[PDB]
Amino acid sequence: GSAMIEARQVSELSTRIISSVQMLSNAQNEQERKEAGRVLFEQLESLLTHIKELGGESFDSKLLDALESNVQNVINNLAELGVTVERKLWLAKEIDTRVEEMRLLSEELEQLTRTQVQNTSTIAVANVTHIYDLLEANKKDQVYQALDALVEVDLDLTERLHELHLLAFKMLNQIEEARTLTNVDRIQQIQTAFENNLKIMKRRVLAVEDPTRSKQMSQLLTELGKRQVVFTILLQQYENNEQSQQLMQKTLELFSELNSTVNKLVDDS
């Protein structure tokens, strides 16, 4: 009877809600999210009044139950979607913040290892220029020693640092890639890598040239090791978006389900 009058509106809203949640899913900041939420709230309130009225046009105890259920599932679905957007925004800011910090740290570490590399080379020139004066004075016995170090320490150190420097550069690249990482597999790969690579640098750093600098670095690696959380937060951002998607899928499936019921209720009327 007059049921077909309400039923339509429900179908009209159903299509607007679906539109509104997509709008909400696209929120990019706290405002957009809030306004979208505003419209979604009203629209949903309207949908509830019409569903209520359409409920008076029936006395089937079983049917209205199903109806109330479809209604409930739609309510929970839209609320979870909202929770999801709330998190999307939180995790974005938080990963950018934490990644920025890390960048600064690993960048410093890379520059530190670089400076050591260039000091180690300068001191090589010197350590040799000294072989000269040491040679002229004919203290050949010492010139011998001065050569052994130039190979056992001076030369051997140059390679050690080149390696350290490659590891720090690698690490820095991983962090640079992290701020826009959305591939679950890749996030885990870098995560495993970043961890193993930090272990290696934690000991390879102990055996550098100066002990007072094996502290500066060991400290930077400690600051970075504590920051490894960011990768789990990146996985959390992944799962959050994944769930957001699935929810929007169910949103459609939940409405064709609600409407499928309002139809059977507009007949038995």
Binding site: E108, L112, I123, V125, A126, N127, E209
Partner: protein, 298 residues
């Protein structure tokens, strides 16, 4: 036991690896409390502002700053250190009438006389008429006393003589970027001498050998370094004005250590530039110039 915080722009050059020995050694000789924080690089301004703020937190009475830019704390120095008295260590620190109220002493050698000392060596080796001598300029980038300051200096000492500049190539002071600049030079052909940064010259030393023109192009540095020195020691280099770095460091330490014990210190100090040649290597002067071997920045 005195809070003195030295802030370098980095610690990669032998130049600063030496300026280091200068503040370090002059810190145990004055028994002060000196800690060193290097910004890790010239474009690392943000990091120095923080290390500058870190100095204060550490409670540095007076801090010796080697700015990664003259106009960096021109209107803000106090805003990062407060009442702390600053001592410029090696670079021009341009403050405002207000900020300036912090600078109590500053060391620093006018590079004009480094380029001059270099051009003077060649104008004396190729007096007007001696015979047109084509030279190649490989100074450095396009800012930090690597251009107009040293240029005009070099230019003056070279103007009234028979020395012509074939051209000039600019590029950051990276050995590789300069090497590339040297190679291009060797390829030209008319080049008699190459006057450039210690970086350029160091590269030229290996490039002239690798290209059998060791004795065909003369190398003239615009400053000294452990590499340009070894070259002088082996005639691989002709000239090189030393602005004594190790001492340039001691000077800054003393300056602040005196202003903090109210003793007399030279407000605007600056060592005297000494001419160096393959045999003109007076030990006493290279000691106040390039750090020892086996040494290590501390």
């Amino acid at each position: 036991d005195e809070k003195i915080c030295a802030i370098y722009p980095h610690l990669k050059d032998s130049y600063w690896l030496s300026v280091n020995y200068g503040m370090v050694s002059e810190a145990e000789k004055q028994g002060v409390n000196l800690r060193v924080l290097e910004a890790g690089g010239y474009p690392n301004k943000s990091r120095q502002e923080q290390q500058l703020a870190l100095c204060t937190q550490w409670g540095a009475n007076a801090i010796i700053l080697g700015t990664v830019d003259p106009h960096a704390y021109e209107h803000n120095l106090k805003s990062w250190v407060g009442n702390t008295p600053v001592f410029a260590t090696v670079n021009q620190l341009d403050l405002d009438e207000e900020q300036s109220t912090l600078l109590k002493g500053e060391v620093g050698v006018d590079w004009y006389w480094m380029g001059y000392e270099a051009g003077k060596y060649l104008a004396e080796r190729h007096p007007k008429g001696s015979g047109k001598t084509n030279i190649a300029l490989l100074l450095g980038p396009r800012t930090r006393g690597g251009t107009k300051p040293v240029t005009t200096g070099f230019y003056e000492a070279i103007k009234n003589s028979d020395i012509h500049i074939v051209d000039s190539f600019w590029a950051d002071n990276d050995k590789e970027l300069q090497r590339n600049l040297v190679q291009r030079v060797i390829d030209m052909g008319n080049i008699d001498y190459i006057v450039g940064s210690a970086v350029a010259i160091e590269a030229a030393i290996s490039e002239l050998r690798s290209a059998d023109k060791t004795h065909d192009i003369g190398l003239v540095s615009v400053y000294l370094s452990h590499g340009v020195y070894r070259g002088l020691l082996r005639n691989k280099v002709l000239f090189a004005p030393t602005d004594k770095m190790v001492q340039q460091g001691r000077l800054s330490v003393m300056q602040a250590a005196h202003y903090l014990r109210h003793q007399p210190y030279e407000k605007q100090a600056s060592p005297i530039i000494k001419p160096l040649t393959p045999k003109t290597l007076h030990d006493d002067t290279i000691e106040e110039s390039l750090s020892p071997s086996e040494y290590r920045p501390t």
